[PDB]
């Protein structure tokens, strides 16, 4: 649901997410991590996720992240920078 | 001849209106002749020697009324008379002290590069004597040392050296450059340095300088809770900016072929 | 990649309403979200933790450069 930024979250939120005590969640997060359904990177500084591979069963809403919220908008930015490479070296392109 | 300009020398200028009348008559002297278009006609230059004396007293009047733009014009004009080759020009008691006053004035406007330029301007005066010239050169040694530490010594160095108005300007030009440090609660008292702005441990007079515009100069975080200074810091996010710099330099190395 | 890759993603972003209007469905063909999520192996926004690694990729980029 959250890629980076909000993906990182406090242990207490995971404690609420696992419906378990925050002290218990230090033990509980490890059990949830153990299932390892999705391979990722997890930091226990705040139990923040910021992990790697994940498989969503389906995308939320109308894939709003897939629109200019994340994708497409970044792609528009790249072509302008590609034009900057052309402007930087038009003669070299020949 | 050309009286009133030299006529009021005994009564210098109790009235500021007299200075204005003197300026109008000086303008009439400019109508008669330019300050120094050429070095020819040394007799006209001898008339300009009388003009130098009235300008020198006029500059003292400008300091007495604390004029800045008019004083700047007069000071530049006095420097131009010294600029005039006029080998015939006689030694002037007013000229030696006023050049020293100009050296102090440069500190007042914070022209530090110029202040050394003025120390250079009179090498023979600086030598060891010219006590009027010596007080600003000693002040310059104190200024690089930090005028704050020796400001009390500088203030009492001469009760009167013809710099009485100029020492008041020196009090006006008290340095507050020490402001970029922790103060108020974190340091609480900076009176130890002895600069007038940070002088006094906590009284309202100290508070007026200390809490001016909230805190001294007034920009930046309040000194009481200030993190030592601006504390801007730096990041390695610049690598993306450095990647943009890499595009320009790398493309050029290829561009040369 | 800047334009043609954007154009196919743009077709799906248009499809969020256009697939509703004429497309089979914005929420359809699992790979529409599954493959896009595979493409979003990198997070896509904010912290990212890719070129912002600092001690990791950034330090290596300097050593090799």
Curated annotation (Swiss-Prot), chain A:
GO molecular function, one term: structural molecule activity
GO cellular component, one term: proteasome regulatory particle, lid subcomplex
Organism field: Homo sapiens (Human)
Keywords in alphabetical order: Acetylation, Proteasome
GO biological process: meiosis I; proteasome-mediated ubiquitin-dependent protein catabolic process; ubiquitin-dependent protein catabolic process
Domain of life according to the entry: Eukaryota
Oligomeric and partner information: Component of the 19S proteasome regulatory particle complex. The 26S proteasome consists of a 20S core particle (CP) and two 19S regulatory subunits (RP). The regulatory particle is made of a lid composed of 9 subunits including PSMD13, a base containing 6 ATPases and few additional components.
Signal peptide residue numbers: none
Similarity comment: family membership: Belongs to the proteasome subunit S11 family.
Name of the gene this protein is made from: PSMD13
Task of the protein: Component of the 26S proteasome, a multiprotein complex involved in the ATP-dependent degradation of ubiquitinated proteins. This complex plays a key role in the maintenance of protein homeostasis by removing misfolded or damaged proteins, which could impair cellular functions, and by removing proteins whose functions are no longer required. Therefore, the proteasome participates in numerous cellular processes, including cell cycle progression, apoptosis, or DNA damage repair.
Range covered out of full length: 283 to 376 of 376
Residues modified to N6-acetyllysine: 16
Annotated protein name in UniProt: 26S proteasome non-ATPase regulatory subunit 13
From Swiss-Prot, chain B:
GO CC annotations on file: cytosol; nucleoplasm; nucleus; proteasome accessory complex; proteasome complex; proteasome regulatory particle; proteasome regulatory particle, lid subcomplex
GO biological process: proteasome-mediated ubiquitin-dependent protein catabolic process
Keyword Aminoacyl-tRNA synthetase: no
Modified residues (Phosphoserine): 13
The PCI domain, residue ranges: 69-238
Disulphide bonds in the chain: none
Positions of crosslink type Glycyl lysine isopeptide (Lys-Gly) (interchain with G-Cter in SUMO2): 204
Keyword Phosphoprotein (UniProt): yes
Assigned keywords, A-Z: Isopeptide bond, Phosphoprotein, Proteasome, Ubl conjugation
Assembly mode: Component of the 19S proteasome regulatory particle complex. The 26S proteasome consists of a 20S core particle (CP) and two 19S regulatory subunits (RP). The regulatory particle is made of a lid composed of 9 subunits including PSMD8, a base containing 6 ATPases and few additional components. Interacts with DDI2. Interacts with TASOR.
Function comment: Component of the 26S proteasome, a multiprotein complex involved in the ATP-dependent degradation of ubiquitinated proteins. This complex plays a key role in the maintenance of protein homeostasis by removing misfolded or damaged proteins, which could impair cellular functions, and by removing proteins whose functions are no longer required. Therefore, the proteasome participates in numerous cellular processes, including cell cycle progression, apoptosis, or DNA damage repair.
Similarity comment: family membership: Belongs to the proteasome subunit S14 family.
Name of this protein: 26S proteasome non-ATPase regulatory subunit 8
Source organism: Homo sapiens
From Swiss-Prot, chain C:
Domain of life from the UniProt record: Eukaryota
Positions carrying N6-acetyllysine: 9, 19
Note: Does not bind a metal ion.
Function, as annotated: Component of the 26S proteasome, a multiprotein complex involved in the ATP-dependent degradation of ubiquitinated proteins. This complex plays a key role in the maintenance of protein homeostasis by removing misfolded or damaged proteins, which could impair cellular functions, and by removing proteins whose functions are no longer required. Therefore, the proteasome participates in numerous cellular processes, including cell cycle progression, apoptosis, or DNA damage repair.
Subunit structure: Component of the 19S proteasome regulatory particle complex. The 26S proteasome consists of a 20S core particle (CP) and two 19S regulatory subunits (RP). The regulatory particle is made of a lid composed of 9 subunits including PSMD7, a base containing 6 ATPases and few additional components. Within the complex, PSMD7 interacts with subunit PSMD4 through their respective MPN domain. Interacts with TRIM5.
Family membership: Belongs to the peptidase M67A family.
Name of the protein: 26S proteasome non-ATPase regulatory subunit 7
Gene label: PSMD7
